[PDB]
């Protein structure tokens, strides 16, 4: 395995420039591999159309993506119809793994998607990217297709200069990973939605359902394949999204919850509830967010249960 974070960073970081699309396509045909691109799509009517159009144009020059799969996460904006009218295979998430109830977020979408992905490789992609450059499709395929032993590949990129990622990455994930999962500290965008692996890998791990999904995947893939089999590819620039700091806070909470849950399974965290601490203070699903408003201080409460899906292998018709 890798000797240190730094040795991994050196051996397992690439630029998209090292994998021209033509070459990859040649290689893929040679390997006899297929690729499903999965777009978990929640109210992305203004963007999925463009992404699908670009994947299509890419496939013109170099056939790399076999299945374009949009999973509509109960959108109210016309997402499903936009995706459909641009030629993607579209599924509502309610209709997949239907015995599971209704959509419980990005993770649930990404997980359920596996039941209809046909490719040997599953490439997850963010559906909300505003100017989708071809390399957001193929860049991460580079190392899975060409480097022995590499099994999982994450995007790295920068906003429009030293980009350590968005705010949840910078202030929640990187700090927690440095402390608890030092092997993950070399990833530039550990929470990126573009990543690819063998379909079998994804079918064999649990998926956290909400925002914590990328966090749980990073940790579980690490434990499964080892750091040496993980890589990242510099894809250049990505206009980061805008969001309200107030809403990032609950996303940060999910990241925390995911680490805490994994720490508890490893046995590093035990007796999470402090003996002495009254029951009334203890409710993990209950997030309190104290704020100051022009009208006084207020205690806001958010209730989100941390739902987790089992390895879909265990639960899908074989």
Residue 186 touches its own copies, criterion: CB under 8 A: yes
For its own copies, the closer of residues 118 and 268 by Cβ is 268
> Do residues 52 and 87 make contact, with C-beta atoms less than 8 angstroms apart?
yes
Contact range with its own copies by CB under 8 A, out of 64-72, 108-116, 276-284, 310-318: 276-284
Non-local (6+) Cβ contacts of 230 within 8 A are: 8, 12, 150, 151, 152, 153, 154, 221, 222
User: Which one of 283, 291, 298, 302 is in contact with Mg ion (CB under 5 A)?
Assistant: 283
H or E stretch including 71?
strand 67-72
The CB-of-139 to its own copies minimum distance in angstroms stands at 13
The pair of three-digit structure tokens given for residue 287, joined into one six-digit string: 């997030």
For its own copies, the closer of residues 185 and 307 by Cβ is 185
Q: How many residues bind its own copies (CB under 8 A)?
A: 75
Distance between CA atoms of 114 and 98, rounded to whole angstroms?
A: 13
Which residues are near Cl ion by CB under 5 A? 261, 284-285, 305-306
Residue 176 touches its own copies, criterion: CB under 8 A: yes
Residue 225 touches its own copies, criterion: CB under 8 A: no
- Give 223's Cβ-side CA count (13 Å radius): 14
Non-local (6+) Cβ contacts of 104 within 8 A are: 209, 210, 307
Distance between CA atoms of 317 and 288, rounded to whole angstroms?
A: 41
User: Which one of 286, 302, 313, 316 is in contact with Mg ion (CB under 5 A)?
Assistant: 286
Instruction: Choose among Cl ion, its own copies, Mg ion, none what residue 318 binds, the Cβ cut-off being 5 to 8 Å by kind.
Output: none
Distance between CA atoms of 59 and 51, rounded to whole angstroms?
A: 12
Q: Is 71 part of any known ligand binding site?
A: yes
Q: Tell me the binding residues.
A: 40-42, 71, 93, 106, 127-128, 211, 240, 283, 286
Residues of the binding site for GMP: 40-42, 71, 93, 106, 127, 211
């Amino acid at each position: 395995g890798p000797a240190s974070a730094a040795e991994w960073f050196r051996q397992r970081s690439y630029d998209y420039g090292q994998f021209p699309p033509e070459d990859l396509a040649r290689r893929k045909r040679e390997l006899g591999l297929t690729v499903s691109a999965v777009l978990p799509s929640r109210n992305v009517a203004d963007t999925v159309g463009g992404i699908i159009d670009e994947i299509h144009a890419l496939n013109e020059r170099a056939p790399l993506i076999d299945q374009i799969l949009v999973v509509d996460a109960d959108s109210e904006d016309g997402t499903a119809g936009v995706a459909a009218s641009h030629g993607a295979e579209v599924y509502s998430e309610n209709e997949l793994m239907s015995g599971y109830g209704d959509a419980h977020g990005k993770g649930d979408a990404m997980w359920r998607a596996l039941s209809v992905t046909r490719g040997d490789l599953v490439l997850y992609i963010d559906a909300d990217t505003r100017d989708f450059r071809p390399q957001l499709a193929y860049g991460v395929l580079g190392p899975v297709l060409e480097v022995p032993g590499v099994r999982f590949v994450k995007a790295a990129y920068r906003r429009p200069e030293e980009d350590g990622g968005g705010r949840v990455t910078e202030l929640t994930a990187k700090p927690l990973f440095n402390l608890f999962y030092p092997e993950l500290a070399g990833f530039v965008q550990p929470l990126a939605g573009e990543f690819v692996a063998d379909r079998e890998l994804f079918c064999s791990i649990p998926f956290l359902t909400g925002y914590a999904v990328e966090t749980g995947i990073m940790i579980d893939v690490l434990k499964k394949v080892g750091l040496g089999a993980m890589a990242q590819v510099d894809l250049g620039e990505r206009q980061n999204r805008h969001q309200h700091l107030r809403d990032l806070s609950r996303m940060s909470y999910a990241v925390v919850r995911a680490v805490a849950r994994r720490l508890r399974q490893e046995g590093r965290l035990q007796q999470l509830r402090e003996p002495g601490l009254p029951e009334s203070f203890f409710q993990l699903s209950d997030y309190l967010h104290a704020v100051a408003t022009p009208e006084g201080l207020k205690l806001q409460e958010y209730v989100e249960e941390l739902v987790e899906r089992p390895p879909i292998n265990e639960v899908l018709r074989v």
